Write a protein that binds this ligand. Structure first.
Ligand code: HEM
Ligand SMILES: C[C@@H](c1ncncc1F)[C@](O)(Cn1cncn1)c1ccc(F)cc1F
Length: 523
């Protein structure tokens, strides 16, 4: 009773402490509070173990962002395959391994949302109305629109254009100019992004859109390029300047696409050339709405942008791994001479399919260097993980990471050794190992239990797998037949830089190239 007066009294003296002790208690009450909250949380047996952190809110973000596969391995040894950690205000429950791939890539639409996790990151860059700034059902239909331009007949015609672009680059780039140099050094992280965007542009976007890249316009891609960073997860729209040249470039680049979209319909200049022709002819949803010309341009940005960063990272890794392995280059070259009749057969999408060792090299690189170490979903409903007393409460996030499983000896013997022969009689981009399902964009595998899942699975599954292998196929067939490359003295494979949007190599990652035929000229 008389004590009740003194909780009151003490509350008044609390308010009248010096700014030195108030400030410090501002930073000790929450620190001491979250340490004692965690301790209570670990007695909850319907929750997966939460890994201890000191700083509240920040959580474990520092070690997760820097070495996420080392973090995952350390957590796996302590608490098994399921565990939570807090990440800059959110709570992520990792499910490692194939049962984890299944728990997350085959989750019900009712249980998890990818849109809910990524809309803050994608929509500022791509524009609105597409990808994650729409309902999952719109997403499924957009993928059906894009995927309707990623056919075998499309792929037969992209191969001469892609190959033209590779040669034009060897001819004209300051990094090569093969008609004036026979040897040189390139930074793969400078060359590979440029090659990707040229080849992707010319093929999917058309010749006009490829043409604009030879000009100043190219910088808008570079400006747009920088708004695609995990920082948009914390400060999505933060009134600074790289946020404006980002948005400037979005408006600017989406304008060029609509200008072309609009003039093509004005002229009925609508053929089967590029994905711009395709999305024009076929972008009406199942309920009857057509995509606005701006929505078509923003899907263009998002598709080109995402495939840009994964494809460019992958050919970088193919070069860096091969730079160290002249025996694999020798092997890949023999297959080039055998399949292409010593160079006296033009490269075709068909002939690419007969090059298993090349396709096995892409396959193996993508095993060791998955471009997305972590995929996320926001949990919408309380989720129960079977064989288990755990519930993942709504508002948590689930995190699948097949790239970690990729690097496990459990599923890949000597997982840390680059070995393309681990895929003998198995050069497939991927393989639907049984029964299939359709979420709107075509029949894809129903199970998602494979330990090798470079293109994920389920509804959010990649619709650019076959394009990626095409691009990477021509690019690497031509690199192989034209150049030998090795590392500078002392140099080896760089470690991955996980902090960016894709695990790309820690730069600079340089290789010395030599012409196989010094006296050869590109016409
Ligand atoms: C080496 C190349 C690529 C790799 C390794 C890769 C990997 C992936 C993965 C793992 C996902 C699943 C995302 C998630 O589950 O959260 C995905 C989604 C997707 N990717 Fe790719 N990707 C590649 C290239 C491309 C290209 C070139 C395109 C376009 C031509 C593309 C378009 C898409 C689309 C449209 C989705 C659907 C996302 C969704 O439905 O939520 N990707 N990709
Ligand atoms: C959202 C994005 C992503 N980026 C980084 N970490 C996780 C991610 F989910 C991604 O899934 C990645 N991606 C897959 N293939 C190409 N890019 C994506 C999907 C569709 C798209 F049109 C553009 C795009 F970037």
């Amino acid at each position: 009773g008389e004590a009740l007066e003194y909780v009151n009294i003490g509350l008044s003296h609390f308010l009248a402490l010096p700014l030195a002790q108030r400030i410090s208690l501002i930073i000790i009450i929450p620190f001491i509070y979250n340490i004692v909250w965690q301790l209570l949380y670990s007695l909850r047996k319907d929750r997966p173990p939460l890994v201890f952190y000191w700083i509240p809110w920040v959580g474990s973000a520092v070690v997760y962002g820097m070495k996420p596969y080392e973090f995952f391995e350390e957590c796996q040894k302590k608490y098994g395959d399921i565990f939570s950690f807090v990440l800059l205000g959110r709570v992520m429950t990792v499910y490692l391994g194939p049962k984890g791939h299944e728990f997350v890539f085959n989750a019900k639409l009712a249980d998890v949302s990818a849109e809910a996790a990524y809309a803050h990151l994608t929509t500022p860059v791509f524009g609105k109305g597409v990808i994650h700034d729409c309902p999952n059902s719109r997403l499924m239909e957009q993928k059906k629109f894009v995927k309707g331009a990623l056919t075998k007949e499309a792929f037969k015609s992209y191969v001469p254009l892609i190959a033209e672009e590779v040669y034009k680059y060897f001819r004209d780039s300051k990094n090569f100019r093969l008609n004036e140099r026979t040897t040189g050094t390139i930074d793969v992280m400078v060359t590979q992004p440029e090659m990707t965007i040229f080849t992707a542009s010319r093929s999917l976007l058309g010749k006009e859109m490829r043409a604009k890249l030879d000009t100043d316009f190219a910088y808008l891609y570079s400006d747009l390029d920088k708004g695609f960073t995990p920082i948009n997860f914390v400060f999505p729209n933060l009134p600074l300047e790289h946020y404006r040249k980002r948005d400037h470039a979005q408006k600017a680049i989406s304008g060029t696409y609509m200008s072309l979209i609009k003039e093509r319909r004005k002229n009925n200049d609508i053929q089967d050339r590029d994905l711009i022709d395709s999305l024009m002819k076929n972008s009406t949803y199942k309920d009857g709405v057509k995509m606005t010309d701006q929505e078509i341009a923003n899907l263009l940005i998002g598709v080109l942008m995402g495939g840009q960063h994964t494809s460019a990272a992958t050919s970088a890794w193919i070069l860096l791994h091969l730079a160290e392995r002249p025996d694999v280059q020798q092997e890949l070259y023999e297959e080039q001479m055998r399949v292409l009749d010593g160079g006296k057969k033009e490269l075709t999408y068909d002939l690419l399919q007969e090059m298993p060792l090349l396709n096995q090299t892409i396959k193996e690189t993508l095993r060791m260097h998955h471009p997305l170490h972590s995929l996320f979903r926001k949990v919408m409903k309380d989720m129960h993980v079977p064989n288990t007393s755990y519930v993942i409460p709504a508002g948590y996030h689930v995190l699948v990471s097949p790239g970690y499983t990729h690097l496990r000896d459990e599923y890949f013997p000597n997982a840390h050794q680059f070995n393309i022969h681990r895929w003998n009689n198995d050069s497939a981009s991927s393989y639907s190992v049984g029964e299939e399902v359709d979420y709107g964009f075509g029949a894809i595998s129903k199970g998602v239990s494979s330990p090798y899942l470079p293109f994920g699975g389920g509804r959010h599954r990649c619709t650019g797998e076959h394009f990626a292998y095409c691009q990477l196929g021509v690019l690497m067939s031509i690199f192989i037949r034209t150049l030998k490359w090795h590392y500078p003295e002392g140099k080896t494979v760089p470690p991955p830089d996980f902090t960016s949007m894709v695990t790309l190599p820690t730069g600079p990652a340089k290789i010395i190239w030599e012409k196989r035929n010094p006296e050869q000229k590109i016409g």
